[PDB]
A paper describes a structure:
Cyt c6 is a small, water-soluble protein (~12 kDa) that contains a heme group as its active center. As an essential electron carrier, Cyt c6 mediates between the cytochrome b6f complex and photosystem I (PSI), enabling electron transfer that is fundamental for sustaining photosynthesis by maintaining the continuous flow of electrons through the photosynthetic chain. The crystal structures of Cyt c6 from both species revealed a conserved fold, consisting of five α-helices, a bound heme group, and loop regions, which closely resembled previously characterized Cyt c6 proteins from other species. The heme was covalently linked to two cysteine residues via thioether bonds, and the central iron atom was axially coordinated by methionine and histidine residues, maintaining consistent coordination geometry in both oxidized and reduced states.
The reduced Cyt c6 proteins were generated using β-mercaptoethanol, while oxidized forms were prepared by adding potassium ferricyanide. Minimal differences were observed between the reduced and oxidized forms, with an RMSD of 0.446, indicating that heme coordination remains stable throughout redox transitions, consistent with the previous report. Structural comparisons between red-Cyt c6-7942 and oxi-Cyt c6-7942 revealed some differences in surface amino acids, particularly charged residues, despite the largely similar positions of heme-binding pocket residues. Analysis of the RMSD values for each residue between the oxidized and reduced forms of Cyt c6-7942 reveals some flexibility in the side chains of residues located on the protein surface, including Gln8, Arg22, Glu45, Thr48, Lys64, and Glu82. However, noticeable differences in the surface potential map are observed near the acidic patch (Asp68, Asp69, Asp72, and Asp2 in Cyt c6-7942), which can be attributed to the flexibility of the N-terminus. Additionally, the oxidized and reduced forms of Cyt c6-7942 exhibited highly consistent dimeric interactions. Small structural differences between red-Cyt c6-7942 and oxi-Cyt c6-7942 suggest insights into the functional mechanism of photosynthetic electron transfer. In contrast, the oxidized form undergoes structural adjustments to accommodate the oxidized heme, providing the flexibility required for efficient electron transfer and subsequent dissociation from PSI. This rapid structural transition may facilitate flexible and effective electron transfer through Cyt c6.
Numbering used by the authors:
A (entry chain B), B (entry chain A): -1 to 87
Write the structure that this text describes.
Amino acid sequence: GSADLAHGGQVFSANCAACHLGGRNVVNPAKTLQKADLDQYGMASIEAITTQVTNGKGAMPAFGSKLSADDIADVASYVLDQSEKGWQG
Amino acid sequence: GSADLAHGGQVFSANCAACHLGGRNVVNPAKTLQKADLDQYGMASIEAITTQVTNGKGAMPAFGSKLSADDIADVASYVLDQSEKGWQG
Ligand code: HEC
Ligand code: HEC
């Protein structure tokens, strides 16, 4: 799949930063995008992130109608990369 | 439509309070459930609220498949009532 990290960061800024700026989670600080939280909840994979972005979960909206498959693959790759590098912001 | 306020408050607690506790908006503080904001954005009517709950908007998830139409009508009635009276919490 698509794994354009820089484009993923753009998708992230346009669609995810409202709730996950800097890798946080303003709606649920127990479920951030930080490595330990992704690991805790089985979310440290492209497949898991793609599914949740596409379909939504709980208070997280779905993005499948607004974003292309490549947009979602890119943002998933961006999230996982940032979690491995330690987020900033 | 259904206008069971106390049931609407239960729907609100289970589905909306993660983001709108006390009539606020943790994601976008310019778009709270306070009367002045609902009035400003044309959201101070039952159908405006039911439509946005049903379809989602921006970072707000959709609920149209997860809640019955009466649940959505009840939560809209609760939101309007609380907004007009003044929220607590
Ligand atoms: C606020 C309305 C959000 C938007 C915009 C985005 N996300 Fe989200 N995210 C939000 C919540 C409330 C949760 C927890 C959902 C639940 O009940 O389980 C999440 C969770 C995630 C996760 C998992 C994090 C973890 O388990 O620790 C990921 C990987 C994630 N969100 C990614 C993500 C993306 C890539 C977004 C933009 C397309 C995005 N989220 C937006 C709230 C919100
Ligand atoms: C966090 C993930 C949210 C959940 C859960 C609920 N809402 Fe929401 N709401 C949220 C956002 C980010 C916004 C702004 C959307 C935009 O881009 O315009 C809203 C907005 C509303 C409004 C309008 C408020 C206003 O115009 O001032 C209403 C009436 C509203 N939300 C109601 C509502 C209901 C009843 C919910 C539970 C079913 C609900 N919201 C959940 C974020 C979130």
